[PDB]
């Protein structure tokens, strides 16, 4: 049923766009964290969570690429 396959192709591509969408929305608030105060604990805590949102931004980029393959590959079958 190529009328259901290609449907699942496009429906799942609009879910990956909507996912890419939230991914770049959360970029700035998860990676531009200023320290709450001017001590060493406040600095450490903000440096990690920004290192973490940065590392998340690559991991998600690499994940989406492989989602892009499955939507292509699923789509190819016809």
């Amino acid at each position: 049923v190529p009328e259901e396959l290609t449907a699942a192709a496009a429906q799942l591509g609009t879910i990956g766009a909507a996912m890419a969408a939230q991914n770049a929305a959360a970029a700035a608030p998860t990676t531009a964290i200023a320290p709450a105060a001017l001590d060493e604990v406040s600095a450490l805590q903000a440096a990690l969570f920004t290192a973490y949102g940065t590392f998340y931004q690559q991991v998600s980029a690499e994940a989406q690429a492989m989602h892009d393959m499955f939507v292509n590959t699923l789509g190819i079958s016809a």
Binding site: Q22, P29, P35, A37, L38, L44, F49, Y56, M66
Partner: protein, 173 residues
Amino acid sequence: MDFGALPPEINSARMYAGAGAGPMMAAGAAWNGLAAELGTTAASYESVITRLTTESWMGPASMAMVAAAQPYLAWLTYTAEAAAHAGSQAMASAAAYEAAYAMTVPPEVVAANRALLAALVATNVLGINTPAIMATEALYAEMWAQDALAMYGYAAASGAAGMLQPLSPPSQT
């Protein structure tokens, strides 16, 4: 260094300045906004591979497609938990700051005590005031112990809030 080795004038100057909880809760809400949208993206994969298998779009080999999708469906459910975790840990982080600000002696309350010490010394010509001079000194040491105990307790909780699940790309099953 050591926070307890620092006088109250420093631990509270450095705490009563800065950005507040604001940046951290914005981090939090963001992490929850992704935890939410990882899972809705997982719940609809779980809907298409689960109708693919059930209806059997490509016979005995419908499997092959479920297979293909698995490494990225796995990453979805695993990372959603990761993001919800960072969400609650961004906020745990900030409640740690807000508790340490609450207990840190305000900078003006410290210097007020210091100026009273200077005032009682200038007028202690007959030494009649010395017990207040040394009562003013004890109260300072109390502020010194309160600021230290606030910073040490802040450090402690920021460790428990600094704990994040390792993130990784998807790899083949």
